[PDB]
């Protein structure tokens, strides 16, 4: 946990979240997985904490989640706003037209 939680990404995802939590009342970040061949946390794999800007309006999960950690929800639909090149680099990752 301490390993793939050292990188700057982990520290940042939080501060943003908190910054947002203070001003608007909310905030969030996500966890994701992919492969590293050089210096993997384990199993040629690592885990990483990603940031989420404008979480109040980018994350919406009304499944009728009746508590704070949305641990009892089933949706959590998120949305991304991105430039042309990004959508390009994205449709490259997830194989899309």
């Amino acid at each position: 946990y301490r390993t793939d939680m050292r990188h700057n990404t982990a520290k940042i995802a939080v501060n943003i979240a908190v910054r947002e939590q203070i001003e608007a009342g909310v905030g969030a970040w996500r966890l994701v997985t992919d492969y590293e061949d050089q210096s993997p946390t384990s199993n040629n794999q690592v885990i990483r904490r990603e940031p989420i800007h404008s979480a109040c309006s980018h994350v919406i999960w009304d499944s009728n989640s009746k508590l704070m950690d949305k641990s009892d929800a089933r949706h959590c639909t998120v949305i991304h706003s991105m430039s042309q090149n990004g959508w390009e680099d994205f449709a490259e990752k997830y194989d899309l037209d």
């Binding site: 990188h7 700057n8 520290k11 940042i12």
Partner: peptide, 28 residues
Amino acid sequence: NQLNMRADLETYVFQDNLATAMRRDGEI
């Protein structure tokens, strides 16, 4: 700032290995 001090190593460490290099420390 110090946050950027860090991205100044993620950039340095990963740089010496390309150019400066030149080490290796075996045991017995």
